[PDB]
Amino acid sequence: DMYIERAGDITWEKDAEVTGNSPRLDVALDESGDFSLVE
Amino acid sequence: GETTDGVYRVMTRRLLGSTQVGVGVMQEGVFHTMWHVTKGAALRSGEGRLDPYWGDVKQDLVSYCGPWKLDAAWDGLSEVQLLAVPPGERAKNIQTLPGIFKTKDGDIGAVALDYPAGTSGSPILDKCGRVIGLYGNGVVIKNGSYVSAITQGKRE
Ligand SMILES: O=C(Nc1ccc2c(c1)CNC2)c1cccc2[nH]cnc12
């Protein structure tokens, strides 16, 4: 049995850690809601 | 129970100790999370109970207490913030420029940040603090890393 606990406010924070790249990927979405790589 | 707006952890005591299986957004009295986090099961909020209202396995989304309320969209140009809520760790904002998932039915924004599976449901925000989608449904690239879509529901 599942339960919820508050973790914080939803706010934009100035000067946050800027990381991660921006890749363009060819994907397919199936009926089970799972993505896969199309190549 | 607690229905204040904000980000929340989704916990379970069924396994060893207390385990974080996901995260969610409380907005306008509705709890929003990813389908694979809860499988549509009822949730507990203190003494209160949250019952599922809408859900879809293909979109991988589910809402509790009412219809899906989140309807902001990524503008296709600006940086966003993943408000990551990792298991056992403090909520933390991570700024990134999203990539693109190209599909046969159009393009979707995608954030390339690798977090544990228990981080699923963590909101992705625009500069106004509005939730433009949830993190936790994507793909595993050649590197072994995870790249999640910016998954957004429909506000009826
Ligand atoms: O596996 C993940 N997500 C997921 C699981 C089950 C299902 C779906 C998505 C959609 N259909 C059912 C995941 C989420 C977040 C970070 C991750 N790192 C490695 N895998 C993940």
UniProtKB/Swiss-Prot annotation, chain B:
Q: How does it sit in the membrane?
A: Peripheral membrane protein
User: Where is each Peptidase S7 domain found?
Assistant: 1-156
Post-translational modification (record):
Acetylated by host KAT5. Acetylation modulates NS3 RNA-binding and unwinding activities and plays an important positive role for viral replication.
Active-site residues, record numbering mapped to chain: H36 (charge relay system), D60 (charge relay system), S120 (charge relay system)
Highest taxon of source: Viruses
Write out the annotated subcellular location: Host cytoplasm; Host endoplasmic reticulum membrane
Q: What does this protein do?
A: Displays three enzymatic activities: serine protease, NTPase and RNA helicase. NS3 serine protease, in association with NS2B, performs its autocleavage and cleaves the polyprotein at dibasic sites in the cytoplasm: C-prM, NS2A-NS2B, NS2B-NS3, NS3-NS4A, NS4A-2K and NS4B-NS5. NS3 RNA helicase binds RNA and unwinds dsRNA in the 3' to 5' direction. Leads to translation arrest when expressed ex vivo. Disrupts host centrosome organization in a CEP63-dependent manner to degrade host TBK1 and inhibits innate immune response. Inhibits the integrated stress response (ISR) in the infected cell.
Q: What quaternary arrangement does the UniProt entry report? A: Forms a heterodimer with NS2B. Interacts with NS4B. Interacts with unphosphorylated RNA-directed RNA polymerase NS5; this interaction stimulates RNA-directed RNA polymerase NS5 guanylyltransferase activity. Interacts with non-structural protein 2A. Interacts with host SHFL; this interaction promotes NS3 degradation via a lysosome-dependent pathway. Interacts with host CEP63; this interaction disorganizes the centrosome and inhibits host innate immune response.
Name of this chain's protein: Serine protease NS3
Q: Which organism is it from?
A: Zika virus (ZIKV)
Which residues of the complete protein appear here? 1514 to 1669 of 3419
